[PDB]
Design a protein around this ligand. Structure first.
Ligand SMILES: *[C@@H]1O[C@H](CO)[C@@H](O[C@@H]2O[C@H](CO)[C@@H](O)[C@H](O)[C@H]2NC(C)=O)[C@H](O)[C@H]1NC(C)=O
Ligand SMILES: *[C@@H]1O[C@H](CO)[C@@H](O[C@@H]2O[C@H](CO)[C@@H](O)[C@H](O)[C@H]2NC(C)=O)[C@H](O)[C@H]1NC(C)=O
Ligand SMILES: *[C@@H]1O[C@H](CO)[C@@H](O[C@@H]2O[C@H](CO)[C@@H](O)[C@H](O)[C@H]2NC(C)=O)[C@H](O)[C@H]1NC(C)=O
Ligand SMILES: *[C@@H]1O[C@H](CO)[C@@H](O[C@@H]2O[C@H](CO)[C@@H](O)[C@H](O)[C@H]2NC(C)=O)[C@H](O)[C@H]1NC(C)=O
Ligand SMILES: *[C@@H]1O[C@H](CO)[C@@H](O[C@@H]2O[C@H](CO)[C@@H](O)[C@H](O)[C@H]2NC(C)=O)[C@H](O)[C@H]1NC(C)=O
Lengths: 342, 342, 342, 342, 342
């Protein structure tokens, strides 16, 4: 029979379907099964404490009032324009800060109804979600980004969200991030929100992201080591080259301070000490100690042969003492940051 | 009886409800009770003089025309689509600079009507609110952010906003700020606006925010102290190292000026003196005084043995005089800024 | 009588009111009285040549077709939803670059009708308005920001805008600006626009803003003076300290040039000379002249006792000559910029 | 007769007017006359290759179906709300990147119909238009900004756009630009687009903009000359001041390189050589040559009286040789850039 | 016959056309032919990993229900307002991140129907599309930007997208890019997406972009070479000029490090080594080696005639050894990067 007649016959004023009434108005709660497909992930900014995602959201529920038997086809696709005339759950994202649909040529929405009355709804969304981040162990850190799906208006007597037993989250093939590695394990847990207005269903997903070290090594760790070695070079210069040694010390100190200030150019103003901060503090301490060493040598050398050998002995000791202590610090730093991290 | 019939029977042309007429058209003013739930707080920018918040707003009032007795249920939830057909107050935020609703999958709105005629309306909002800030005592400052709820069109004869006796403001669990600490005490006060058009109800809430010092200590206070100590190092160098001492003085002066200029990189161009400005001024004065000291010593030393001991005595006095005066300044600074602040 | 009946009886198809026809279709022009209330002012950017304001706009006119006598109340408030069914003037802002209404919980609009037929319309607006600025006397400047209200479609035969005799402009209490002081005198003048399409009514308001000097003093004027004094210090160093004196001169010159380049970091690329530019040019000239002085002294001193006293005499003269000429320049600069400004 | 009746009598279902049918459905093409009024011009960014304009657009055409004779008035203004019910051309801007209407208090639109059937339509628009720019002769450049008006859906058999014989483009009085001078001559030319879908009418306007040099002179050209003179100063220093001369050379070289890098901070990454690039290259070459000169002098002077006079003779020759060659370069540069530009 | 009658006679309730039903509801799949015209290309940002395009999209398909014979004209243009009443495919862009239509004066849309029932639909779109980029060989790189057209709701039984046999992609005449060269060969390939909901048609286009080297040569490669030559200059200075040589070495090292840090100012934080990174590493190694050479020479020279000739011999060897090794490195670098790239 004519396709146009069946649609309004089923969902029209003649039938009596009301899209403001739940499938079972007084009865067991509606059970909604959800799965998400991630099409792109990125735009993770520490400063604005947020990340941007683009996902496909699928919802499944049973509506006994939409059961159709007469029509031959087992499964019926429909038109996106008729979504307004069916009941839909009022899902919202609790941690969302921005959202929008897509209307690129048409509404990016799908609807499918089965003979038994099952409904499949798929929609394309773009979300900016908030993610609290811990910045300790900042270079060698693992973050967790959550996404919470909640009901705004229906209590647990009416609506109950659940996860699909197989394949709740799948990621698009070939998706990669410049600064992070997305772990394949996703944690599916139950959250329930309590307010003065009642109890509301909630579901959550946790994503594990590991930062990549190559950029930080090429950028910060290696120039600091170069400045430390440059300061070490001064121990092999003649003690009579006072302007040269003093200029080298001052330049190294100022460069170290500038790099330390610039290492936090793209981070939130946190109030604790990070690993990069410990590293820069130790390197600045070494450079300053080298300058103080030459200062002591110069003070000793003008006290007039006993004073000559004593000042030379300081230079010889510092030539084999500064690299050894820095090597010990590097061993202690890199190990414990592969132990405290885990 | 059928759910669909009751809704239009109560709120339809047949009943005669008009959403443009107040619950008591000529009579005592409508009393509206409000409470807010804060779901996220952040984005506090000194430059743009504003902060961003995301809140849930609940309004309660009594409408005698909506009293229902026949239906069995004590409390009736409804559909968000029918909000257009009920009377709602015209609340607006006086200090608002931007606002938007959420339509992530549906309208984020709730409505509930009770047997007696009481209505509960809940809506999700995102607001950018303006906050005047005082920048004196800038590192050690406590700010106050206000939010004002006012009626645009109804005078006090018609509409009166009030606060709920229990729990007007609650904050979501685990909410934290990177640079601030939100105090638990909130001040509930009465504001009333007077214009040439009449008298209008207003309500206000004040939030107390205390800045955290760790970032400022790691960033500004410690490098300035390092530069001061670096300038102090010059007193232990031989007076004959004129290029070395002059280069050290010039480098310290230029670095101090650059840090002083950069300490106000992310602040509004205010016209008063902040504490950080006093600190940088004192440190620049100390560095310049050290350079002037070596200048005087060099001028004295070339006046040709009496001139030799006098110039050496200046260096010995300045070696125990510059640290003592700076220690006294640090004691006087840090105390009074823990006394004038309170 | 029933409130709902009177509204459509007055403004309905039964009555014959047409919102597309003026109050007097063929007759004397409609006279509209306007007043504005300023709720916030700020966001004055020299680069984007614009400023942002948030105002309440009130319009008053007489409509003889809306005269009501039967109803007892002298003054009738109404609902914002019915604005579409009354005639309203087509006011627009000629200098506007951006605008938006507010829909925070409802439309921020008010309407009131009186027995005689007078209408009061109040609306909340946010406007980004363009302001041509003159940058000469840039630190010590007084700007004027205009706002023009004009009719887009009606000629002077139909619509005539006027200002209210008492209180056209009032400002909200406690409004302050970080970098400017808003003067209390506002200039109310008549503007009329002439085009190839006809004559159109226009009204304008001028606001006087005076820049505050504290920020510029702390930022630019004082470090430049410090660099000049630092260059002056070189006159007291021994003439044999050639590397020290040359390094001091080069560092001062480079620092002066960098500060001069950075003094125009946040301004439009204008093609004339500002006062700050004159100041930096004079300070750079003084620093360069000091370097040229030491250059001449060093050239003279190696010409081999007559050459010894002549070179020393140059240093002694320059020690009392450079501060005196700079003091004279400061006197001439600061006076005339308190005379030419007025 | 009643004003309301005439409007729907002329343009209503009773009359049979169809706004989807052209004035002459099968017949000579519709001829549309256009003129634009420019109210503000600015926001010319080289990086984003675009400029922002705000214009009033006037369209004129004849519709024989709208001819009215009975009504007394020769010319009838109308209401903006009825624009949807008349046929309008489908003008679009081919080079447009962003556009928006204005709804500040009402739609900023005008419509007027005459007895003969002529229609005048005026609308307010804000456009961001794309402008290809040639960056050779970058300081002394003249740009051309185009704006193209085209029909999207109608071929030349149906629609033909033309320019008005008198006053197509007029500019608002007092309009000025910070960095450019708008020439008074505007070029009116005919463009026609050819696609696989057919032939479409197009019209274009070209605006000539000349850059102002004051900013570039104060910013780039003068500090480079100062650095060149500073390097020249080294020729008058004693040849025994090796650290001083070497430090001066290195500082001048590094400063020159930094200024050369910073001269292209706000420009697109083009792949050709600009005039500023030639200038900085020549100045860097002069500074390096001065350093190489002192290097050669120092190498010659330690070859041990014949070697003493030869090295002094090099300094004396370079003291009168470097300024002369730079003066010749300045003469050749500034002339040809006032000849090749024209 | 009257034009208005034919339109609703063909596509009206009287005819029975339903825009929610496919041209052949149960039958062979609908075959859609597509071609795109590119009007502007640009805004390629490595940081935000995306590019902006502005295209015209043409779709062609056959609808047997729209076959018209009676009307004389072979081809009928129509009005954009009636697009809502015809069936249209639900094309979407899978890699899209932002999109918008144009409404500059009217909807920028075209529709044309032929006698046989063929439909041509043309629409103007602006798209921000995502493009994964490989940054190895960063200066000498060739990128590929894809654009994917997919069906959101229809499976392959219903809808099948295909490319036109002649001229699928054409580019507007005179289109150029500042930093890239668009290759004339475009790759047309078949993509099909598989999901848990079914099989969906997809089509893709690949664009090849080659980066231009002029900007990178003028900006990065040449100043680094200048710094290397500047460090080479130190070999010709007297070995007794210890402050001069040490200052030259330190300044060159610090400048090299600053340029290396600044070479990645506008790129994503990738974790691999680029060619520019290899170049800066080699240049920094050469500068440091030069400083270490002078350090060794100074250490050797103070070991007290045998020590005098040995230290001089080191300087003479390094004067002909450093340029030769750097020339060999330049030969090996530039060749293999013209071989590994291809
Ligand atoms: C939604 O799922 C819930 C949870 O399984 C269902 O509630 C159970 O239903 C079974 C079957 O009738 C009862 O025997 C249990 O006692 C129920 N348990 C609870 C905790 O309620 C519910 O019936 C489902 N709703 C629908 C419409 O299928
Ligand atoms: C809204 O609250 C006000 C304030 O309590 C009520 O006004 C009072 O009402 C009581 C009870 O009728 C009177 O006895 C008082 O004289 C009123 N005081 C004032 C200052 O008005 C008002 O009745 C309430 N409105 C409604 C609809 O309940
Ligand atoms: C609007 O104001 C104008 C200006 O006062 C009025 O025009 C005058 O009206 C008076 C009273 O009828 C006449 O005597 C004058 O000759 C008019 N002068 C001019 C210059 O027109 C006008 O009547 C007012 N319109 C309305 C509707 O009140
Ligand atoms: C629009 O303008 C065109 C160009 O002038 C008109 O076309 C001409 O019309 C005259 C007068 O009938 C004819 O004699 C010419 O042969 C036409 N020339 C061409 C090239 O077509 C056209 O008639 C105008 N359309 C309207 C509706 O006035
Ligand atoms: C759309 O194109 C497909 C592919 O050519 C058509 O499918 C073929 O149709 C021919 C002609 O009837 C058959 O003989 C083939 O067996 C079909 N092949 C396949 C793989 O399906 C299809 O008919 C076209 N649809 C329309 C409406 O023209």
């Amino acid at each position: 029979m004519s396709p146009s007649d069946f649609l309004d016959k089923l969902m029209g004023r003649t039938s009596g379907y009301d899209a403001r009434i739940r499938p079972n108005f007084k009865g067991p709660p509606v059970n909604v099964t959800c799965n998400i497909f991630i099409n792109s992930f990125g735009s993770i900014a520490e400063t604005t404490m947020d990340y941007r995602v683009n996902i496909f959201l699928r919802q499944k529920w049973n509506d006994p009032r939409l059961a159709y038997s007469e029509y031959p086809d087992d499964s019926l696709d429909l038109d996106p324009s008729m979504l307004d005339s069916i009941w839909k759950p009022d899902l919202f994202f609790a941690n969302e800060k921005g959202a929008n649909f897509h209307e690129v040529t048409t509404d990016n929405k799908l609807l499918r109804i089965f003979k038994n009355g099952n409904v499949l709804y798929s929609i394309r969304l773009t979300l900016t979600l908030s993610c609290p981040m811990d910045l300790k162990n900042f270079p060698m850190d693992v973050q967790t980004c959550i996404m919470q799906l909640e009901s705004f208006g229906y209590t647990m007597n009416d609506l109950i969200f659940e996860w699909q037993d197989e394949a709740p989250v799948q990621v698009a093939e070939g998706l990669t991030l410049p600064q992070f590695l997305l772990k394949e394990e996703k944690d599916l847990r139950y959250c329930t929100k309590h307010y003065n207005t009642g109890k509301f269903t909630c579901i959550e997903v946790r994503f594990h992201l590991e930062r990549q070290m190559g950029y930080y090594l090429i950028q910060m760790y290696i120039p600091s080591l170069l400045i430390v070695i440059l300061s070490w070079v001064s121990f092999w210069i003649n003690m009579d080259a006072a302007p040269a040694r003093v200029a080298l010390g001052i330049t190294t100190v100022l460069t170290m301070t500038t790099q330390s200030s610039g290492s936090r150019a793209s981070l939130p103003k946190v109030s604790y000490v990070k690993a990069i901060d410990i590293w820069m503090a130790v390197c600045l301490l070494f450079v300053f100690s080298a300058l103080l060493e030459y200062a002591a040598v110069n003070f000793v050398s003008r006290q007039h042969k006993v004073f000559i050998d004593r000042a030379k002995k300081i230079d010889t000791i510092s030539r084999a003492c500064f690299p050894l202590a820095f090597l010990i610090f590097n061993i202690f730093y890199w190990v414990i940051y592969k132990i405290l991290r885990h």
